[PDB]
Each structure stands twice: as structure tokens, then as C-alpha cells.
Amino acid sequence: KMAFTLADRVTEEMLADKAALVVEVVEENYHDAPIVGIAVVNEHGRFFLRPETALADPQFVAWLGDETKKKSMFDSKRAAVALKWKGIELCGVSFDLLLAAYLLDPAQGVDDVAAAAKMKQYEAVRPDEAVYGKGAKRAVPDEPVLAEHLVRKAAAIWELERPFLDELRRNEQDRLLVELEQPLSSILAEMEFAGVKVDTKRLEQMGKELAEQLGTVEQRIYELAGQEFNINSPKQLGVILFEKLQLPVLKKTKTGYSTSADVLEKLAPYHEIVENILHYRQLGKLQSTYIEGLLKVVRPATKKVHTIFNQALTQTGRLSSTEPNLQNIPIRLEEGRKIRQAFVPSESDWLIFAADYSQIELRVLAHIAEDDNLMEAFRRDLDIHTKTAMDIFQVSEDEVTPNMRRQAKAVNYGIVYGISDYGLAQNLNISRKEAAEFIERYFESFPGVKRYMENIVQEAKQKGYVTTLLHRRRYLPDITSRNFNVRSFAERMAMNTPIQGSAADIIKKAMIDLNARLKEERLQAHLLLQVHDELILEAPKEEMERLCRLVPEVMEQAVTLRVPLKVDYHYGSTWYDAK
DNA sequence: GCGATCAGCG
DNA sequence: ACGCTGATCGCA
Ligand SMILES: [Ca+2]
Numbered sequence: 001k002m003a004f005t006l007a008d009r010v011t012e013e014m015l016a017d018k019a020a021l022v023v024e025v026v027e028e029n030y031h032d033a034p035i036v037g038i039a040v041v042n043e044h045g046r047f048f049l050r051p052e053t054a055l056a057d058p059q060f061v062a063w064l065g066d067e068t069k070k071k072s073m074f075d076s077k078r079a080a081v082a083l084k085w086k087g088i089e090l091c092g093v094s095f096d097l098l099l100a101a102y103l104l105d106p107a108q109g110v111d112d113v114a115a116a117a118k119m120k121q122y123e124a125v126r127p128d129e130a131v132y133g134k135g136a137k138r139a140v141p142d143e144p145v146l147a148e149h150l151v152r153k154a155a156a157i158w159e160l161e162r163p164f165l166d167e168l169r170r171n172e173q174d175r176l177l178v179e180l181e182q183p184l185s186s187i188l189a190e191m192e193f194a195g196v197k198v199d200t201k202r203l204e205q206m207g208k209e210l211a212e213q214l215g216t217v218e219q220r221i222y223e224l225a226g227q228e229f230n231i232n233s234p235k236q237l238g239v240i241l242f243e244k245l246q247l248p249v250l251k252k253t254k255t256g257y258s259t260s261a262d263v264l265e266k267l268a269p270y271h272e273i274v275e276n277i278l279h280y281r282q283l284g285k286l287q288s289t290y291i292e293g294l295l296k297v298v299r300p301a302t303k304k305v306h307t308i309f310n311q312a313l314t315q316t317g318r319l320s321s322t323e324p325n326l327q328n329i330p331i332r333l334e335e336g337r338k339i340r341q342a343f344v345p346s347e348s349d350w351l352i353f354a355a356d357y358s359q360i361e362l363r364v365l366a367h368i369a370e371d372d373n374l375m376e377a378f379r380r381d382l383d384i385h386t387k388t389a390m391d392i393f394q395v396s397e398d399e400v401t402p403n404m405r406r407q408a409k410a411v412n413y414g415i416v417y418g419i420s421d422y423g424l425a426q427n428l429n430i431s432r433k434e435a436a437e438f439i440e441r442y443f444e445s446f447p448g449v450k451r452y453m454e455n456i457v458q459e460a461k462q463k464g465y466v467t468t469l470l471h472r473r474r475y476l477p478d479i480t481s482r483n484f485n486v487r488s489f490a491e492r493m494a495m496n497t498p499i500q501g502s503a504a505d506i507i508k509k510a511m512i513d514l515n516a517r518l519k520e521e522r523l524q525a526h527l528l529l530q531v532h533d534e535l536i537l538e539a540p541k542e543e544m545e546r547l548c549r550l551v552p553e554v555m556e557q558a559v560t561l562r563v564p565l566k567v568d569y570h571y572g573s574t575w576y577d578a579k
Numbered sequence: 580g581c582g583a584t585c586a587g588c589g
Numbered sequence: 590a591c592g593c594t595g596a597t598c599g600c601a
Contacts, residue, residue, distance in 0.1 A: 233599060234583075253583065256601050260584060285585060289596055316593060318588085325595050328587035336586080361589050361592095410591080413589060417591035426590090488590080496592045500589060504593095532588040532593085 002124070004039075004046035004151040006143075010057040013044035020158040021071040022150045023079035023090075026132055026140055029323055030078045031192070031306040032085045032299075036140050039150035041158045048147035061088055070094040072157045074113045077185045077192075077311065084193040091186075097157050099181045100164040102312035103173045107475060110312070113153040120163045125152040172471040180470065180505065181311065183512050188309045188319075191527045195304030196326065197346040199574075200295065206338065207291040210283055217280050224273040231280055234259050245271055262426070282333065290330060290339050297324050304346065309530070316501040317472045317508075319530055327531045331579065332406075343575035345538045353525070353544060354578035355551045355569040356534035359384060360503045364469070365416060367561035368498065371448025378563040385409045392428065392438075415442050416449055416499075418492040453495045460494040468498055469559070470505040506565075507533055510558035517554050521546065536578065544571050 007014065019042040027033035038049040054060040063069050064083065072095040073079060080090040101108065101116035110116040112128040131149045132138050140146060168174040222228045225244065229236035238257035241247050247270050251258035261281075264274045297305050310320040321327040329343070330336025345352055357363075362384055366374040377384055388408035389400040410427060411419075421436035428435065443450040457479070460466050465475045474497045478490035511530065518525055525539030525547055535555070539547055552567040559565070572578045 230599080232584095232597095235599085235601070238601090254601090255582070258583085281585075285597085288598080289586070293596070310594095314593060318593060320594055322595065325586080328585090328595070330586060332587085356588095359589085409589085414591040417589090420590040422590050424591090485590090492591060496589090500592065503589075534588080 002148055002152055004048055006147055007047045007049050010054055010060045014040050014047045015059060015063045016042040016044060018042060018070045020154040021073055022154045023082065024150055025078055025082045029308060030082045033082055035082055037146050037150045039154040041154040046151045046155060048151055055086060055088060065089040065091055067091040072161050074098050074157055077189045080189040081193050095161045096182050096185060097160060098312050100168060100177055103177055104167055105475060106315050113156050117156045117160060120160055122156055122160060125156045171473060176470050180508055184508050185311060187511055187515050188311060192306055192309060194526060195306045196528050197304050197344050198298050199342040199344050200298060200303055203291060203295060203342045210287045210291060214283050217276060217283060221273060221276045221280060231277060247271060286336050294324055315474055316497050317468060317504040318532055326529050340576035341574045349541050350538050351541050351544055351571050351573060352575050352578040353537045353539055353547050353571040354534060355555055355567050358566040358568055360533050361499045363561065363563050363565060364502045365449060365499050366563050369449045369452035371446050374446050374449060375563050381566060384412055388412050415439055417496045456498060457491045457494050466494050466498050468505055469502040472501050472505060503533060506559050510555045513558060514554050517550055
């Protein structure tokens with residue numbers, strides 16, 4: 001039902017200077033994944049190519065790599081990384097429909113062309129699920145069915161760039177798409193393809209040591225509980241704790257007894273099995289997720305893991321990291337922080353460099369709320385987390401333990417993002433009246449932040465959405481809900497999303513300026529990871545000096561706020577030593 | 580498949 | 590009854 005050429009060879013009319021392009025990687029994880037078909041829609045017609053044909057043709061490769069030949073795509077990063085695994089560069093992507101859809105409404109969860117087309121009442125294209133099937137029935141269909149479905153996706157991309165750019169313009173998001181998200185998409189492709197090298201010997205050794213520490217812990221648990229049970233099964237774990245040992249019930253999930261770590265820490269005075277269980281889970285978490293899980297996804301030839309950065313998933317504009325998640329590698333506990341010793345540079349004589357913004361969401365909040373005292377605090381380069389530990393625990397700066405600090409870190413974010421006195425009290429083991437009066441005092445020092453939280457909720461109510469400093473947008477329909485719980489979660493979304501998503505935009509612009517900087521300095525240094533407010537690079541040791549002077553300035557200068565941005569930086573032989 | 584849990588980022 | 594994630598595991 002759609003006219004197109006099944007091309008046997010590459011012709012000149014498939015090489016126009018503007019085109020919609022589809023490079024299908026059906027595999028979920030597109031690293032080293034097969035390319036199953038290629039479709040080109042342009043002013044001369046609709047063409048389907050087999051990858052063996054086109055990806056071996058010198059003119060087609062030349063056309064993919066030519067930045068002056070513009071391509072419109074859905075999920076250009078997926079295509080670009082699959083082609084990198086094939087020795088082929090893709091440039092000139094001028095429109096990425098996936099990222100256009102994402103800016104317009106991140107809650108749609110657009111994950112194929114058909115879902116984004118629907119936003120503009122375009123339906124001449126099928127959902128990928130309907131073509132490839134789900135689960136274990138997943139299959140590339142036959143060439144005639146595959147070819148039409150790629151051509152329909154391409155035709156759809158072709159027809160929708162203009163209506164999508166039009167809405168982006170009205171929303172003030174067009175420069176956000178073309179100058180921020182699409183450039184960032186090429187950078188993330190380089191980072192994902194480059195990978196991070198992993199010391200598998202060291203990781204293997206930790207795994208053998210974790211196995212023997214686990215049993216030993218697991219044994220004391222069995223002799224304290226009397227019997228044995230699936231310590232991971234809250235069924236009999238509940239029966240052990242809140243029935244056999246008769247410990248108080250402090251929380252009930254919808255399932256039953258809550259055995260979460262906040263509860264267990266509160267039961268620590270009652271019995272010496274709750275601490276062992278906690279130590280057991282920690283050791284379990286390290287062994288399943290970061291020892292075993294990491295070794296599974298290591299590419300054996302190179303000992304590099306290749307994350308996938310989701311750019312169009314989170315509701316606030318942050319990235320997300322998947323298979324493996326390299327954005328929640330342990331750091332706070334010593335046993336788990338040792339895992340970062342396994343993450344090493346990909347080349348002898350190279351080092352890891354890591355820079356990060358100091359309390360960036362609070363600096364943003366100070367800029368957006370225009371709160372005098374909060375702006376002054378950061379113009380003094382105060383550490384508000386330590387200064388809050390001092391007020392909480394009534395000590396001096398020298399006496400602030402890192403524990404008291406991370407606790408005040410949660411009070412600072414918790415208070416500004418709507419924590420209740422109940423919630424503040426559960427986290428400080430103080431009375432609920434003390435927690436309420438601390439929150440009153442805290443908004444005495446920062447009335448401008450209080451005004452800001454009231455106003456942003458009135459602005460959500462009026463407009464239907466909240467925006468970020470760079471005009472990322474998030475619809476909050478529940479902000480006017482009649483249900484008190486549903487309305488309150490939406491109010492705290494209105495207080496949080498403009499801040500957290502403004503910090504995501506800032507580090508996104510920083511990454512873009514960093515790459516351009518590294519290119520004019522022509523350094524071999526390159527990004528490896530982004531962990532929300534931290535940029536981790538690797539580089540030859542000969543380049544660290546330059547990087548110490550370039551990376552902080554580039555980050556601090558990404559945007560200009562009414563308070564300065566602060567950046568800490570370290571380097572070392574491993575990611576461990578880079579903090 | 581989903582809820583609980585927990586690792587990280589703020 | 591602060592917010593944003595992803596992986597693992599058990600299953601009331
Ligand atoms: Ca930080």
C-alpha cells in the first residue's frame with residue numbers, strides 16, 4: 001500500500017542532500033547489534049536497501065558520514081552506535097523525532113515512530129511491536145514486510161519534522177532540540193561506543209572474597225534466628241522478625257511486614273540479627289548487581305562495558321544508564337567503593353579525570369527563587385550541607401562526621417522539595433513538633449524559597465505544566481486533582497522538576513561545550529560517563545594538567561546564574577582514585 | 580510482571 | 590507524608 005523501490009544497488013538519487021533515514025537495529029541493546037534494513041525517503045522517492053549492499057557501497061558510506069547531507073531520523077543514537085560497531089560514521093542528523101517527541105511531552109513514553117506519529121494524528125505506520133512481535137515470538141519479518149515498515153517509518157519521519165518543529169518553536173523548545181539534545185546525542189554515542197575498561201581480575205577476586213564473607217554472615221544469621229530461611233524472602237523473614245523474635249511492627253507494605261533498611265535500623269536496639277541481615281543484603285547487593293552483573297556485560301575481547309544512555313526516558317530531563325547502570329556504582333560504603341577500583345583507563349599511561357558540580361540544584365534554586373540569603377550563602381561558597389549538619393546536631397564544622405553531613409544533605413533537599421514534619425521526624429529520630437519547628441525556622445532563613453514553592457504550584461495550576469531554565473516542560477495534570485494524595489505528589493513534582501531538570505540542562509550544555517573545547521585544544525581526552533552532576537573523562541597522563549584548567553572552567557561557565565557554579569575535580573589511576 | 584529493596588545522583 | 594532513576598529477586 002506504500003510505493004517504494006527495493007533497490008539492488010545504490011544510485012545517485014538515494015544520495016540527496018536532505019533525507020529521512022532508518023537504520024533498523026531490532027535488538028534492544030544496539031551495541032554490536034545487527035542492522036537489519038535501511039530505508040531512505042527523500043524528494044526523489046522511497047528506497048529500501050539491504051545493509052550488505054549499502055553499508056559496503058563507498059558512496060553510501062560517504063553519504064552517511066557527510067555532515068552537509070542532512071538526515072532526519074528516529075533515535076539517531078541507536079543507529080549511530082550500531083554503525084560505529086560496523087566501522088561507519090553517521091553525521092548530519094538534523095532532526096531526531098524521538099527527541100522532538102520527548103521535549104514535547106516526556107510522559108507519552110514514545111518508544112517507536114508510530115507512538116510519536118500519533119501525537120500529530122499520523123497513523124500510516126505500525127507500532128514496532130506489531131511488526132516484530134514481543135517476547136519470545138520476536139522475529140524480523142520477511143523482506144517485503146520489513147521493507148515496507150522501514151519505508152513507512154521513514155515516510156513518517158519525513159512528514160513530521162515540520163509539524164514537530166512548529167510545536168517546538170511555540171513551546172520555546174526548538175533551540176533546545178537543535179542546539180542541546182541533538183548535539184548531546186552524538187556525544188553520548190561516542191561515550192557509549194568508547195566504553196569503560198574493567199579490571200576483571202580484581203573484580204573476580206572480590207567476588208570470591210564476597211562469596212566466603214557471605215556464608216559466614218549468612219551463618220550467624222541462621223544461628224541468631226535459630227533456623228534457616230530465604231533471607232531474601234520477606235515471607236519467612238517477616239515470620240522470623242515480627243513473629244518468632246516478636247519485634248515491633250513499624251511499617252506495613254501492601255504485601256505485609258516491611259523489612260526495609262529504615263525499619264531495620266530502628267530495630268537495631270532490639271536484637272542483633274537486624275544488623276547482620278543489613279550486612280547480608282549489602283554483601284548480597286554487591287555480589288549480584290556489581291560483581292556478577294557487571295562481569296556478565298563485559299565484552300571479553302576488550303574488557304570494556306558499554307552502557308546505553310537513555311536520553312528520552314526521565315520526566316525531568318536527566319539521563320539514565322542501562323545494562324549496565326554505570327550511574328549507581330557503589331561509593332558510600334568502603335567494601336562497595338572498592339568496586340570502583342575495577343574501573344580503569346582503557347590504555348596504559350592514561351588516567352581517569354572526574355569533575356562535578358557542588359550542590360548544583362540548591363544553587364539553581366537560589367537563582368530561580370531569588371532568595372537573598374540562599375544567594376548569599378553560595379556567593380560565600382558555603383557548604384550548606386555541612387552548615388545544616390552543624391545546626392541539626394549542634395556541633396562545630398570540624399565535628400561534622402560524613403554521616404551527619406549526608407543526613408543534612410537529605411534534610412536540605414527534603415525540605416525544599418516538600419517533606420512533611422512526619423517525614424523529617426522519621427529521618428532525624430526527633431519529635432514531630434521539633435521537626436515542624438525546624439521546618440518553620442528553615443523557611444524563616446529562606447522565605448524566598450518558600451515564596452517560590454507556593455508560586456510554582458500556582459503556576460503549575462494555571463498553566464498545566466512546569467518548565468526548566470532551558471524550557472524543558474513537564475505536564476502535571478494531577479496538580480488539580482480532587483484526591484489529596486494525588487494532588488500532593490503533583491505539587492512536589494512542581495517544586496522539584498524545574499530545579500532538578502534545570503541542573504540536567506546545565507550539565508548537558510557543559511558536556512557539549514567540553515567536547516568542542518577538547519576538539520580545539522585537540523586533546524585525545526574524551527568523556528566516559530555522566531552521573532547527573534559529574535563528568536568522568538579518561539585521558540593520557542600528559543594531558544591531566546590542561547584538563548585541570550579546562551574542565552572546571554568549561555563547567556563553571558556553561559550558564560550564568562545569579563550565583564557562581566562550583567566544580568570539584570580529581571584524577572587518579574582508577575575511578576576510585578578519581579574521587 | 581510487579582512490588583519491595585537498595586545502589587546512586589540531587 | 591522530599592524527587593529522579595535501574596537491577597535484582599521473590600512471589601502475601
Ligand atoms: Ca556533587
